[PDB]
Design an enzyme around this catalytic site. Structure first.
Site, PDB file in Angstrom:
ATOM      1  CG  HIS A 198      -1.524   1.202   1.548  1.00 43.19           C
ATOM      2  ND1 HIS A 198      -1.740   2.187   2.410  1.00 43.19           N
ATOM      3  CD2 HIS A 198      -2.706   1.782   0.947  1.00 43.19           C
ATOM      4  CE1 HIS A 198      -2.229   3.381   2.451  1.00 43.19           C
ATOM      5  NE2 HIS A 198      -3.055   2.980   1.435  1.00 43.19           N
ATOM      6  CG  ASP A 199      -0.298   4.986   0.527  1.00 44.34           C
ATOM      7  OD1 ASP A 199      -0.921   5.321  -0.623  1.00 44.34           O
ATOM      8  OD2 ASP A 199      -0.589   5.394   1.606  1.00 44.34           O
ATOM      9  NE  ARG A 223      -3.096   4.727  -3.582  1.00 48.25           N
ATOM     10  CZ  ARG A 223      -3.467   4.697  -2.308  1.00 48.25           C
ATOM     11  NH1 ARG A 223      -4.127   5.893  -1.858  1.00 48.25           N
ATOM     12  NH2 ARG A 223      -3.990   3.627  -1.594  1.00 48.25           N
ATOM     13  CG  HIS A 264       0.411   9.383   1.274  1.00 43.34           C
ATOM     14  ND1 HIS A 264       0.259  10.456   2.277  1.00 43.34           N
ATOM     15  CD2 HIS A 264       0.296   8.302   1.360  1.00 43.34           C
ATOM     16  CE1 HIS A 264      -0.577   9.569   3.100  1.00 43.34           C
ATOM     17  NE2 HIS A 264      -0.456   8.205   2.632  1.00 43.34           N
ATOM     18  CG  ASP A 282       0.152   0.010   5.411  1.00 42.96           C
ATOM     19  OD1 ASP A 282      -0.036   0.256   4.480  1.00 42.96           O
ATOM     20  OD2 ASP A 282      -0.503   0.654   6.442  1.00 42.96           O
TER      21      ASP A 282
HETATM   22  O1  INS Z   1      -6.479   6.601   2.377  1.00 40.11           O
HETATM   23  C1  INS Z   1      -7.116   5.382   1.766  1.00 40.11           C
HETATM   24  C2  INS Z   1      -5.887   4.539   1.527  1.00 40.11           C
HETATM   25  O2  INS Z   1      -4.821   4.828   0.992  1.00 40.11           O
HETATM   26  C3  INS Z   1      -6.763   3.198   0.680  1.00 40.11           C
HETATM   27  O3  INS Z   1      -5.551   2.181   0.556  1.00 40.11           O
HETATM   28  C4  INS Z   1      -6.959   3.798  -0.613  1.00 40.11           C
HETATM   29  O4  INS Z   1      -7.675   2.514  -1.452  1.00 40.11           O
HETATM   30  C5  INS Z   1      -8.275   4.727  -0.521  1.00 40.11           C
HETATM   31  O5  INS Z   1      -8.361   5.258  -1.749  1.00 40.11           O
HETATM   32  C6  INS Z   1      -7.675   6.168   0.204  1.00 40.11           C
HETATM   33  O6  INS Z   1      -8.352   7.225   0.396  1.00 40.11           O
END
Ligand code: INS
Length: 304
Positions: free
Chosen positions: A29-30, A66, A79, A280
């Site tokens: 994630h991210d 992102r 981010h 994460d």
């Molecule tokens: O903060 C959230 C998070 O990063 C999730 O993983 C994502 O799917 C969403 O779009 C975001 O709003």
């Protein structure tokens, strides 16, 4: 016989007949926040500490990219507001470099506009990405362009497959690649059809959940995936949450508590269908504790 002893090549060992939906795939994630190094500005913003290339050596095959358009020809990896100090093209090269190395691995790149574009910018983010990235000469062999909807591993071996959160796109290859993109619910477990009714998208993205309700939320999805062997269902189960799940000091510190715990379940289940886990702090293992990424990898069934 454990597949994760060598995370760099784990896929190359699966059955290339499998659909990629049927593949238990660890994700970050991210993914590009690993560039943050101010410990303060890092408490919630930082979700990973390895780079793409290590995430890769580490066994990560789903990256949550992102982006924000800062130029008609440029997509910045962000981010939210927070510029993450590289360009989309940073990820693509490292990935191109990497499949190039382990040619029988595939990556699913998710691409979601996390921030509004800069004032100069005129082309939409999708426009920007279809034009200067997907349909670009440099990345030409890398992006799966395949006709199939339930792409096989054989088909996508060596290719960056799209898991598109950009909304409607004029791209036709990848996940939810069609004129109506993927409707995504805010903060929820939800189910949708994508790629024109060809595939069902069952997601747990309850990112606002307090920590015990998060955990119950991932288990809930995982208990669905486990007993579902339909190719036409894709599962994406986010192990990440906001604010440490309101239980912890930092995303790292939250990470340290979900992953191992979720890892225990997965391990309890043995070789079952789990879908795609987005974590994460991917590839971070605490002495004594199961490793979510490894267990994801070893949950696959490979050879009889
Ligand atoms: O903060 C959230 C998070 O990063 C999730 O993983 C994502 O799917 C969403 O779009 C975001 O709003």
């Amino acid at each position: 016989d454990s597949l994760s002893k060598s995370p760099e090549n784990w896929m190359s060992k699966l059955d290339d007949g499998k659909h990629l939906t049927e593949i238990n795939i660890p994700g970050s994630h991210d993914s590009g926040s690993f560039t943050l190094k101010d410990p303060v500005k890092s408490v919630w913003a930082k979700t990973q500490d390895k780079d793409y290339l290590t995430q890769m050596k580490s066994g990560v095959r789903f990256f949550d990219i992102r982006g924000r358009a800062s130029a008609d020809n440029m997509i910045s990896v962000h981010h939210g507001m927070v510029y993450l100090h590289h360009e989309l093209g940073k990820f693509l090269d490292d990935a191109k470099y990497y499949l190039s190395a382990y040619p029988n691995e595939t990556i699913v790149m998710s691409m979601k506009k996390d921030y509004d574009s800069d004032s100069k910018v005129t082309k939409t983010f999708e426009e920007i990405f279809r034009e200067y990235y997907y349909n670009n000469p440099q990345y030409q062999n890398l992006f799966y362009t395949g006709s199939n909807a339930n792409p096989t591993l054989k088909e996508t071996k060596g290719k960056i497959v799209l898991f598109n959160r950009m909304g409607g796109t004029y791209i036709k290859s990848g996940y939810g690649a069609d004129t109506s993109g993927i409707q995504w619910a805010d903060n929820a477990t939800f189910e949708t059809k994508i790629n024109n009714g060809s595939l069902n998208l069952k997601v747990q993205d309850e990112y606002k959940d307090y920590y015990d309700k998060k955990v119950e939320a991932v288990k809930n999805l995982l208990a669905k995936a486990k007993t579902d062997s339909n190719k036409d269902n894709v599962y994406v189960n986010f192990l990440s949450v906001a604010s440490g799940g309101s239980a912890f000091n930092s995303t790292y510190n939250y990470a340290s508590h979900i992953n191992p715990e979720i890892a225990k379940t997965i391990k309890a289940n043995g070789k079952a269908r789990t879908g795609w886990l987005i974590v994460d702090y991917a590839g971070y293992t605490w002495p004594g504790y199961d490793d979510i990424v490894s267990e994801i990898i070893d949950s696959n069934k490979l050879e009889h």
